[PDB]
Each structure stands twice: as structure tokens, then as C-alpha cells.
mmCIF file of N, CA, C and O in Angstrom:
data_model
loop_
_atom_site.group_PDB
_atom_site.id
_atom_site.type_symbol
_atom_site.label_atom_id
_atom_site.label_comp_id
_atom_site.label_asym_id
_atom_site.label_seq_id
_atom_site.Cartn_x
_atom_site.Cartn_y
_atom_site.Cartn_z
ATOM 1 N N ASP A 1 -1.654 -2.739 5.779
ATOM 2 C CA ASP A 1 -0.431 -2.392 5.136
ATOM 3 C C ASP A 1 -0.280 -0.838 5.026
ATOM 4 O O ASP A 1 -1.268 -0.110 5.265
ATOM 5 N N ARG A 2 0.930 -0.406 4.673
ATOM 6 C CA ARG A 2 1.235 0.991 4.490
ATOM 7 C C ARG A 2 1.317 1.398 3.008
ATOM 8 O O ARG A 2 0.546 2.122 2.465
ATOM 9 N N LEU A 3 2.414 0.857 2.480
ATOM 10 C CA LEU A 3 2.673 1.123 1.067
ATOM 11 C C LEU A 3 1.740 0.259 0.192
ATOM 12 O O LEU A 3 1.277 0.795 -0.915
ATOM 13 N N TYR A 4 1.471 -0.934 0.620
ATOM 14 C CA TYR A 4 0.518 -1.812 -0.050
ATOM 15 C C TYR A 4 -0.956 -1.437 0.238
ATOM 16 O O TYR A 4 -1.850 -2.002 -0.342
ATOM 17 N N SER A 5 -1.114 -0.567 1.202
ATOM 18 C CA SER A 5 -2.453 -0.159 1.600
ATOM 19 C C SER A 5 -3.006 0.901 0.664
ATOM 20 O O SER A 5 -4.136 1.385 0.834
ATOM 21 N N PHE A 6 -2.177 1.195 -0.348
ATOM 22 C CA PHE A 6 -2.568 2.159 -1.386
ATOM 23 C C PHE A 6 -3.419 1.561 -2.449
ATOM 24 O O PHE A 6 -3.662 2.145 -3.489
ATOM 25 N N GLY A 7 -3.978 0.373 -2.091
ATOM 26 C CA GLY A 7 -4.863 -0.367 -3.091
ATOM 27 C C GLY A 7 -4.031 -0.840 -4.232
ATOM 28 O O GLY A 7 -4.003 -2.034 -4.575
ATOM 29 N N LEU A 8 -3.370 0.150 -4.876
ATOM 30 C CA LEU A 8 -2.583 -0.162 -6.124
ATOM 31 C C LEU A 8 -1.231 -0.777 -5.713
ATOM 32 O O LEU A 8 -0.208 -0.080 -5.684
#
């Protein structure tokens, strides 16, 4: 993911 790859 990109935006969801931010862990949070």
C-alpha cells in the first residue's frame, strides 16, 4: 500500500 503503508 501507499497511504495505508504508513502503518497508521
